[PDB]
Write a protein that holds these residues in place. Structure first.
Motif, PDB file in Angstrom:
ATOM      1  N   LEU A  42      36.703  48.170  45.269  1.00 10.63           N
ATOM      2  CA  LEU A  42      37.971  47.622  44.845  1.00 10.63           C
ATOM      3  C   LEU A  42      37.771  46.212  44.331  1.00 10.63           C
ATOM      4  O   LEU A  42      36.724  45.579  44.596  1.00 10.63           O
ATOM      5  N   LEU A  43      38.718  45.728  43.578  1.00 13.51           N
ATOM      6  CA  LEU A  43      38.646  44.385  43.086  1.00 13.51           C
ATOM      7  C   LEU A  43      39.110  43.464  44.190  1.00 13.51           C
ATOM      8  O   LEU A  43      40.280  43.475  44.577  1.00 13.51           O
ATOM      9  N   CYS A  44      38.205  42.697  44.702  1.00 13.18           N
ATOM     10  CA  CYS A  44      38.498  41.818  45.791  1.00 13.18           C
ATOM     11  C   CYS A  44      38.088  40.428  45.386  1.00 13.18           C
ATOM     12  O   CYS A  44      37.382  40.257  44.383  1.00 13.18           O
ATOM     13  N   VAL A  51      39.482  40.909  55.155  1.00 14.99           N
ATOM     14  CA  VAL A  51      38.074  40.626  55.003  1.00 14.99           C
ATOM     15  C   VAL A  51      37.345  41.953  54.864  1.00 14.99           C
ATOM     16  O   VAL A  51      37.469  42.835  55.716  1.00 14.99           O
ATOM     17  N   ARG A  52      36.645  42.113  53.786  1.00 16.15           N
ATOM     18  CA  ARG A  52      35.925  43.335  53.516  1.00 16.15           C
ATOM     19  C   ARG A  52      34.461  43.076  53.822  1.00 16.15           C
ATOM     20  O   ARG A  52      33.689  43.999  54.117  1.00 16.15           O
ATOM     21  N   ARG A  82      29.761  30.123  52.107  1.00 15.64           N
ATOM     22  CA  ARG A  82      31.072  29.489  52.084  1.00 15.64           C
ATOM     23  C   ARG A  82      32.170  30.502  51.779  1.00 15.64           C
ATOM     24  O   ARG A  82      33.355  30.238  51.998  1.00 15.64           O
ATOM     25  N   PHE A  83      31.773  31.665  51.302  1.00 21.58           N
ATOM     26  CA  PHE A  83      32.728  32.618  50.773  1.00 21.58           C
ATOM     27  C   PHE A  83      32.765  33.920  51.544  1.00 21.58           C
ATOM     28  O   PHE A  83      31.744  34.454  51.980  1.00 21.58           O
ATOM     29  N   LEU A  84      33.931  34.427  51.673  1.00 24.29           N
ATOM     30  CA  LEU A  84      34.208  35.683  52.309  1.00 24.29           C
ATOM     31  C   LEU A  84      34.687  36.629  51.232  1.00 24.29           C
ATOM     32  O   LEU A  84      35.164  36.184  50.192  1.00 24.29           O
ATOM     33  N   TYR A  85      34.527  37.890  51.433  1.00 27.69           N
ATOM     34  CA  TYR A  85      34.969  38.852  50.464  1.00 27.69           C
ATOM     35  C   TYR A  85      36.245  39.441  50.983  1.00 27.69           C
ATOM     36  O   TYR A  85      36.232  40.199  51.961  1.00 27.69           O
ATOM     37  N   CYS A  86      37.327  39.075  50.380  1.00 30.89           N
ATOM     38  CA  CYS A  86      38.620  39.460  50.862  1.00 30.89           C
ATOM     39  C   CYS A  86      39.329  40.302  49.830  1.00 30.89           C
ATOM     40  O   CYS A  86      39.348  39.963  48.651  1.00 30.89           O
ATOM     41  N   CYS A  87      39.877  41.391  50.253  1.00 25.69           N
ATOM     42  CA  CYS A  87      40.575  42.268  49.360  1.00 25.69           C
ATOM     43  C   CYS A  87      42.068  42.146  49.600  1.00 25.69           C
ATOM     44  O   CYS A  87      42.503  42.006  50.754  1.00 25.69           O
ATOM     45  N   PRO A  88      42.874  42.169  48.533  1.00 29.05           N
ATOM     46  CA  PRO A  88      44.326  42.066  48.644  1.00 29.05           C
ATOM     47  C   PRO A  88      44.931  43.298  49.320  1.00 29.05           C
ATOM     48  O   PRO A  88      44.312  44.384  49.357  1.00 29.05           O
TER      49      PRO A  88
END
Length: 32
Positions: free
Chosen positions: A2-4, A17-18, A24-30
């Motif tokens: 998915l586009l996160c 949080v995916r 510094r960055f987390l992969y978060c999906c809407p």
């Protein structure tokens, strides 16, 4: 998959949080 968004610090309220996208960055999906 998915586009996160790679969120630095934290995601937005409602984003899940995916995984992580860096030190510094987390992969978060809407949620929507």
């Amino acid at each position: 998959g998915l586009l996160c968004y790679c969120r630095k610090g934290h995601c937005k309220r409602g984003e899940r949080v995916r995984x992580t996208c860096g030190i510094r960055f987390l992969y978060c999906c809407p949620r929507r």
